[PDB]
Amino acid sequence: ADFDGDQMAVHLPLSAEAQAEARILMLSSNNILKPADGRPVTMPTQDM
DNA sequence: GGCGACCCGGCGCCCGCTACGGAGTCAACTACGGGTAGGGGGTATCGGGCAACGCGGCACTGAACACCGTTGTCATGTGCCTTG
Ligand SMILES: [Mg+2]
């Protein structure tokens, strides 16, 4: 997702189970490593 | 005469979402006959508006008895005086 111009859908987990999964499984901070080859993907390089 | 290419048909698909324009189009006819449906007309049936009149507590009716309280009342008992 570059910032040239891009829209991103936002979805709402409703049930207690859904927000539980989103809190535990689908969290942004528990997916540092890319599943393709198990290397970091959450440290981009453009500016920092 | 099954192999064989080849030929052909015939089919199967062809990243993701939002968000983003409108446009809308060429050749019968009449007669009948019914039946439904509308309209108003009139009619039986259901629904809305009022004071007595159901109640009840108690209250008055005190009236007529009852419940103590009272000073009415009586015939009948002590104390002093007179005579045996
Ligand atoms: Mg982009």
UniProtKB/Swiss-Prot annotation:
Residues of the full protein shown: 534 to 581 of 1299
Binding site for Mg(2+): 2, 4, 6
Subunit composition and interactions: The RNAP catalytic core consists of 2 alpha, 1 beta, 1 beta' and 1 omega subunit. When a sigma factor is associated with the core the holoenzyme is formed, which can initiate transcription.
Cited function: DNA-dependent RNA polymerase catalyzes the transcription of DNA into RNA using the four ribonucleoside triphosphates as substrates.
Organism field: Streptomyces coelicolor (strain ATCC BAA-471 / A3(2) / M145)
Name recorded for this polypeptide: DNA-directed RNA polymerase subunit beta'
Assigned protein family: Belongs to the RNA polymerase beta' chain family.
